[PDB]
From a paper:
Roquins are a family of RNA-binding proteins critically involved in maintaining peripheral immunological tolerance and preventing autoimmune diseases. The human genome encodes two Roquin paralogs, RC3H1 and [name]. The N-terminal regions of these two proteins are highly homologous and are composed of a RING (Really Interesting New Gene)-type E3 ubiquitin ligase domain, followed by a unique, so-called [name] domain of approximately 300 amino acid residues and a CCCH-type ZnF domain5. The [name] domain binds to a highly conserved, stem-loop-forming constitutive decay element (CDE), which is found in the 3′ UTR of many mRNAs encoding regulators of development and inflammation.
The structure of the RNA-binding region has an elongated shape consisting of 13 α-helices and one β-hairpin. The first three and the last three helices form a tightly packed unit that has little contact with the [name] domain. This six-helix bundle was found to resemble an HEPN (higher eukaryotes and prokaryotes nucleotide-binding) domain based on a structural homologue search of RC3H1 using DALI9. Analysis using the Rapido algorithm confirmed that this region is composed of two rigid body moieties, which correspond to the HEPN and [name] domains defined above. The two domains are connected through two flexible, proline-containing (Pro173 and Pro324) linkers and no buried interface exists between them. It is unlikely that this difference is caused by the RING domain in the RC3H1 structure because the RING domain has a large contact area of 863 Å2 with the N-terminal helices of the HEPN domain, but makes no contact with the [name] domain. The RNA-binding region can be separated into two domains, [name] and HEPN, which move relatively independently. However, neither our apo-[name] structure nor the [name]/RNA complex structure contains a similar protein-protein interface in the crystal packing.
Residue numbers in the entry: 91 to 111, 124 to 396
Write the structure that this text describes.
Amino acid sequence: ENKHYEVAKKCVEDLALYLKPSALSRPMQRKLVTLVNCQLVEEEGRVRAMRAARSLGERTVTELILQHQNPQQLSANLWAAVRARGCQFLGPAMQEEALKLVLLALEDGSALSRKVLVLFVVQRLEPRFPQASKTSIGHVVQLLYRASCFKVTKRDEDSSLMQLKEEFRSYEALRREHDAQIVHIAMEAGLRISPEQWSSLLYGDLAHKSHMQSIIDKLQSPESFAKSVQELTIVLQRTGDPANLNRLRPHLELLANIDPNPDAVSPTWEQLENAMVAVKTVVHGLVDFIQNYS
């Protein structure tokens, strides 16, 4: 006898059919299960469902953006940005040894002109890595300078001398500020990159997600659902949108306007119905788009 409840329940059952008693990613599975378990005859269940739907929606936007993202074009863009600010990243093994060699020189509180510091490193990097040039090592040093690792002392008729600050005289402290500056460069160039891409880019493995997450939390605020939809819009403007993903926009906007905060007003049946319809439409879209286009 309740049209709204029937459409809504109908929408949820339909989405349940994506669950194997692997059409979706595991995140989507987790979040879908949450919505499906919601009891729409109770208020605490209608509320929890509005929250679930927003989550599914925000995630859908994310996977769509990720689908358009080429990691080979993305990394070239990272290093271009780095080089455009005078710095370099020589690749996981090489940077490691170089930062260590910097550390080795200045740990004790030694003070060396930039030129003297570069030579020190390059000399000791020769055996394991002969492609090292005074210019490349220079840029690694400029990287550390940009991250404000050095205390520097002016002199007349002779070179300025550089010391590491007390607080960076360890590889943990040094690598952390180093890694942070390369993120800060990513942000300046307008590149959202994920702890897993980062871990892969700087160390060459998936084992530094946690370390990297900690920095991004410190340097960046997470992007609202709203700003993500705007992000996808632009991509779609640039591609021309042959799958008509832009048809999902009304629905994503509806979902993003759901107030997730816990002081929020419970939904009306209408609002609930519209939300379930919206999330159904969006999720179906994601699946169809992945199944039909690369």
